[PDB]
C-alpha cells in the first residue's frame, strides 16, 4: 500500500515523460499533414486533449454541489498555464510571435476580459452557454486562419498522437492517485492539500506537453497549447461547471488572470516571449501561490 503508491507515482511520471513527447511529435506530424500551423494544432487538439481532466473535474465537482472547486480548478489552471507552464517554456525556448498569432492572442485577451466582466457576480448556466459558444467560434476561426486512402505516415502520426495523449492522461492520474495513496499510507492526509494535488494534477498534461514541445523548439505549439487550454478551461471546463450550478465569483483570481493575459499579449505584440518574460511569469506565479486563499 505504501509503495503501491510510489509504484503508481513513478510510473505516472514515466508515462508523462514519454507520453508527452509522443503526443508532441504526433501533433507536429498531424499539423504538417493538415497543412496547419503548430499553433493551430496546439490550440485545438492538444489544448482540448490536455484540458479533459479540467472539464471532467469541473463538471463532477459542480454536479456534487461543490461549485467553488469547479471554478477554482478552472481559473487556477489558467493562471498556472501562463505563470508556470509558459514561464518555464519561454526560458527554455524563446518565442518571437508573428503578426498573425498576435491577432489570436488579442482575441484570447478579449475573451478573458469578457469572462471576467460577466463573472463579477458569478457564472450562471447562461454564462456557460455563452462562453461555450464563443469557445466553439474561437476554434473554427483559429483553424481557418491557420489552414491551407491510408498512408502509413498519417496512420503512424495518429497513433503517436493518441497513445501519447493516453500516456499523459493516464500518467497524470497515476501520479495523483500514487501521491494520495502515499499520503494516506503515511497519514499526512489533509485534503486541504488534496484539492491542491488534483488541481495541479489536472495541469500536469499541459506542463509536460509544453516542456516537451519547448525542448524541441516548437514555440508556436507551446503558445497554442497555453492559449487554447485557457480558453478550453473557461469556455469548456468553467462553462460546463455553470450548467450544473451557479459558480461563485472568483474576482481576485480573474483579475490575476486578466493581468497575466494582458502581459502575455503585450510581450507577444511589442517584444518577445523569452528568458526575462519567462522569469517574470514564474515570479508572478510564485507570488500567486504564496498569497491566494487556498
Ligand atoms: C452542452 C450543450 C448545452 C447544455 C445547456 C445546459 C443547460 C442546463 C440548464 C439547467 C437548468 C437551469 C434552470 C434555470 C431555471
Ligand atoms: C501575481 C500577483 C498575485 C497577487 C495575489 C493577491 C491575492 C490576495 C488574496
Ligand atoms: Cl513552432
Ligand atoms: Na489543455
Ligand atoms: Na489540463
| H and E string | HHHHHHHHHHH
Shape summary: globular
Q: What percentage of the residues does DSSP assign to strands (E)?
A: under 5%
**CATH-defined architecture of the largest domain:** Up-down Bundle
Please give the largest β-sheet: none
Bound molecules: pentadecane, chloride ion, sodium ion
GO molecular function, one term: calcium channel activity
Family: Belongs to the Ca(2+):cation antiporter (CaCA) (TC 2.A.19) family.
Transmembrane segments: 3-23, 39-59, 77-97, 106-126, 128-148, 156-176, 192-212, 220-240, 247-267
Membrane topology: Multi-pass membrane protein
Keywords:
calcium channel activity; K/Na/Ca-exchanger; Methane Monooxygenase Hydroxylase, Chain G, domain 1; globular; 294 residues; binds pentadecane; mainly alpha; monomer; transmembrane helix; binds sodium ion; membrane; 2 domains; calcium, potassium:sodium antiporter activity
